[PDB]
Amino acid sequence: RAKAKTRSSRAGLQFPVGRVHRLLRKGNYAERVGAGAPVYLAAVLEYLTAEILELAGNAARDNKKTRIIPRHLQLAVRNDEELNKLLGRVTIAQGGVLPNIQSVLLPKKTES
Amino acid sequence: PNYALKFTLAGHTKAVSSVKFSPNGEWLASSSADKLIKIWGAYDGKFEKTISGHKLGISDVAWSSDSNLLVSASDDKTLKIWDVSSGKCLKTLKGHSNYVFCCNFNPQSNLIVSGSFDESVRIWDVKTGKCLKTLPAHSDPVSAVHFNRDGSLIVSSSYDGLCRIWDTASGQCLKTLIDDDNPPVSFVKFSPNGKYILAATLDNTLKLWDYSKGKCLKTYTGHKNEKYCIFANFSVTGGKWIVSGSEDNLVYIWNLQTKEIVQKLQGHTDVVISTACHPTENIIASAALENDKTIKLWKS
Amino acid sequence: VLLALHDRAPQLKISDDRLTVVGEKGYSMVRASHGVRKGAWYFEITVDEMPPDTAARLGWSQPLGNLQAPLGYDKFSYSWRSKKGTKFHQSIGKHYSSGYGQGDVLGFYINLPEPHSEIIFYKNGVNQGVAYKDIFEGVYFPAISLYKSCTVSINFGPCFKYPPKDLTYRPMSDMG
Amino acid sequence: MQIFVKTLTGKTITLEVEPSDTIENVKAKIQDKEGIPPDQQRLIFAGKQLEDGRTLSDYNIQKESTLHLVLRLRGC
Amino acid sequence: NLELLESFGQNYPEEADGTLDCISMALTCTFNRWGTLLAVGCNDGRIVIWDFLTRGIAKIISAHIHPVCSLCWSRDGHKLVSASTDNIVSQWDVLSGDCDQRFRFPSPILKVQYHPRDQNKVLVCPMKSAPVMLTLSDSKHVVLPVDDDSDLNVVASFDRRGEYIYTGNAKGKILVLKTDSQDLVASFRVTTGTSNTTAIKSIEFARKGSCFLINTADRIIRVYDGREILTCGRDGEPEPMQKLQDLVNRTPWKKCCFSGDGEYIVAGSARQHALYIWEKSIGNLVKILHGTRGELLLDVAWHPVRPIIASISSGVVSIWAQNQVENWSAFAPDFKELDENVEYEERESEFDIEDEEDEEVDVTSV
Amino acid sequence: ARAEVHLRKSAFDMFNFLASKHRQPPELPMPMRFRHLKKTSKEAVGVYRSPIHGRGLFCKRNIDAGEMVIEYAGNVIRSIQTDKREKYYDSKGIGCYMFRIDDSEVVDATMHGNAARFINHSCEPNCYSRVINIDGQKHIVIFAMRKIYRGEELTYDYKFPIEKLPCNCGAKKCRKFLN
Ligand SMILES: Nc1ncnc2c1ncn2[C@@H]1O[C@H](CSCC[C@H](N)C(=O)O)[C@@H](O)[C@H]1O
Ligand SMILES: [Zn+2]
């Protein structure tokens, strides 16, 4: 009968905690589920999403585009060092690669 | 303005380099460059002994809060520990590469500051004896460094107008008071309230700089100081007396309001280069350059 | 007959009407190629809005000046300050006369009868002070160091708002 | 019943109320005349807490008395 | 005392900054009134004092053979009081280090404290029996009467002003006593959990006001205001200003103290050696700290006027302050190190414009 | 030594930065790299005591031939204020450091700037610059020429038309002039 403070705003987050608690009861991951785990896990997922979307937005401005197309995501992951180690064996669709040419495949000049 | 001449203290073959009192106000060492420091008193010229054992010429001696620790800032580019009640040197603080001009002690008896001409101010431990930190300070040989009221600030001048304020613990500079003209700011010192810092320049203009804003609009003129690092002081037992030395054989004392000549006390025979105020009496040490060699004490 | 194409600061807000401009971030002394050599010619400067810290220097300058340089440097140009009425010309500081307000109908008149000059500050057709005398060789362009973002508007037509009292000039709609 | 509520800040405030009112009436009156957030209207009856879920007549205080409010954050 | 023009966005401690690798086997720590010294007890019964501004070791005093596990400073900063398993009411000088009082009285002591204004009244907290207040010259000892006598674990202290004596048993019943006449003016049992009571480990106070802390044993630090106890009086039922706990690791605490301004609360683990810092007002964690990952924490201090924090682990006393960043314009204030294209046109008094002291201040004042 | 009359005191202007330990070693599209530049220009370079002339800009990170090094940024002036600021800086006894971008404006470095003032001159350079567009506001970006190792004091050529002041830097195959 009291105020329906949802567990998102009662925590101070943006990811839902009801959907996370449903997908931890109904995944057959354990018998009993605590009441700190879905909150903590919602926070972790939010922080990783914020971490990649910051760099995505920076690259999206810096190529002079409004939206974000996945080429920016490929550049934003593979330019960073720790996110590339996280996304180790991952192929983003429509991704492309970093521009990389070796050191000996391009000519050099000596005379005059 | 009734400080009359009373005594005469001599006995040094080179120039009497500096005369600074003990901070308790009971002693006054005659550090002269002739490798002789006669341990004089402070009330009549009370000779105790002559402490020597140096290597080259003496430039400056410092004083600590116990009035026992003395350090030799001799021309041997080192600093040696000289306790009064020892008669026995303990350590020698090697590490400079040029001559040592000025040195001081903290107000709580456990720091040593040094000065070297090659633009690197070194910080020294007292008891365990180690070069603590090194400061790439100036463009010039070191003129004057000074601890504040307790040991948090270090003011520093130069030969081209760089009144720099330094931190004790972090060991980086904090504030640089600069004038567009460059009179060589020979001698600087604090004030007991921690709000004012004195300066001495080679243009016949003596200023007590404010600490925060850094200005002085009541400035002194009309005196004689254009070639040397004449020491200036503060008399503590009268009123607002501003003590300094002279070049024309005089003892300069003034009041804050005056900005003129009110009192030029005669008696010496050379450029008065080193004075100190006895911190518990109306006694002012006074010794001039090489053509005097006769330290003359004063009394109201 | 519009504002200048060649003789303008290119960063100005010369809009599609080419009569009203918003001031830029410097002493943007915009000139105009519709300037006088000799004769009897006068227009108005229908200034409308002038925000604070948007000064304006009024005078007549010669075509060999700089677009970014403020008015009143040498014999090319004669300047004057809004606040306190302090003209500055040939590196001289002289607190001279009374200033102006905000968004009045300005515009000065100069006359060269065929060597001698008529240099008077005209604020709504009122004598406000004689600035200088005996101008030298050259064409004379309207140069105003628009200081910051202000609303000024040059007037061209014969429907003059504050014409000078009993002063004769050919109208400025007969040159372009 | 004109109660006095002098807090620990010299902030005396008066409400001429009925002896048979609830806590919500006092919350509405203080929130009207001062805008004080009603999660801090804790009152004290001889040391013990006056709980904010009952009526005024459940404690039988002498009429037109003086109480004391505590500046409290409850829902932050 | 320090620089006033220094505050270029001052901070709250982040770094490790370097420690005292001089003498190990530390046991407890406490600062003086201003935050200029730090007494530290050894393992064999000695005192280590470290001065802060010079960053120098001040004085080493060898007290006794029993390990020193309780310390306090006087108001002037001249009388150290301490007690240990040596059973002795001690009192020490800071210029000399003298055995001024020596009274081996049994049930060895767990905490001492001065009255915060008069240094004549000192606190004594026995091994079992009720806490004792003493004088300096004569042996006038005041044991506070306890209705329980069953815990044999009673904690008590004086607050910021020394107005009253807050006492606490190991059953969680508080008996407020007046500081001289022992007036039982207020009493409350702590509302622990649903119903079941808990023990009380320690109680400390502030430097500004009457907000204070309760360190229970159900892993819940509680924050009350002493004026609420005064407003209650007898048979009080206080509910706290702010409750504190960390249920992720379920960590019982070892030591707490407040900030200098009474704004921030530090509290330390008994398990992980990881310090936490809270806001008093809005009520959340702001920062976790760490250290040597497998050591056992003993005692945490705080510096009042300046954000410096002292820890104790494996006899090593850490000092954590910002690893502060130095830059230009202190060597040359006429030049300031910018970053990008800064425009300079806002002043209008350019292009060749030419226009048309008396304060007597003392020099040897305070 | 105080009775000695050492007068090395004041023969130059007021400024210093000397006596530092100036011996470290003996040895993509455009705006993303502009972000990279604003990131790493602090950790890349360093100003220390040169043996060439006073001070100079060293190098610490091993630079590949082509990357950005630093942005030479300061106050922004136009073409009028040059002679006025030069007369003021000559009146106070201050060296004047300026750099023209293009046919529009000049970036100052005297009263406000960065750690990029302090590159000396040579005629065998290893740095240059171009013109870019970070949203209309153009900039002054230090590229590179060859693989620069650690400890080298950095240099670049000034593109002077050959037009007084002699060569007080001493390069190897220099024309004994800046112009
Ligand atoms: N090798 C050199 N010796 C002296 N001046 C030089 C020089 N090369 C260039 N210059 C001139 O001097 C300026 C170099 S900036 C000098 C570095 C730094 N300001 C310092 O004081 O050490 C430039 O304006 C340039 O015009
Ligand atoms: Zn050259």
Short mmCIF file of C-alpha atoms and ligand atoms in Angstrom, two decimals, chain F residues 121-123 166-171 174-179, ligand 2:
data_model
loop_
_atom_site.label_atom_id
_atom_site.label_comp_id
_atom_site.label_asym_id
_atom_site.label_seq_id
_atom_site.Cartn_x
_atom_site.Cartn_y
_atom_site.Cartn_z
CA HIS F 121 66.46 26.53 -34.61
CA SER F 122 68.48 24.40 -37.00
CA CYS F 123 68.75 23.90 -40.74
CA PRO F 166 73.18 36.77 -36.32
CA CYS F 167 73.04 32.97 -36.00
CA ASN F 168 73.13 32.43 -32.23
CA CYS F 169 72.29 28.72 -32.45
CA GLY F 170 75.07 27.03 -34.44
CA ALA F 171 73.72 24.27 -36.68
CA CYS F 174 73.63 26.30 -41.64
CA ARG F 175 73.81 29.43 -43.78
CA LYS F 176 74.96 31.42 -40.68
CA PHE F 177 71.57 33.17 -40.63
CA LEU F 178 67.96 32.54 -39.69
CA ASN F 179 66.85 34.21 -42.94
ZN ZN G 2 70.85 29.49 -37.16
#
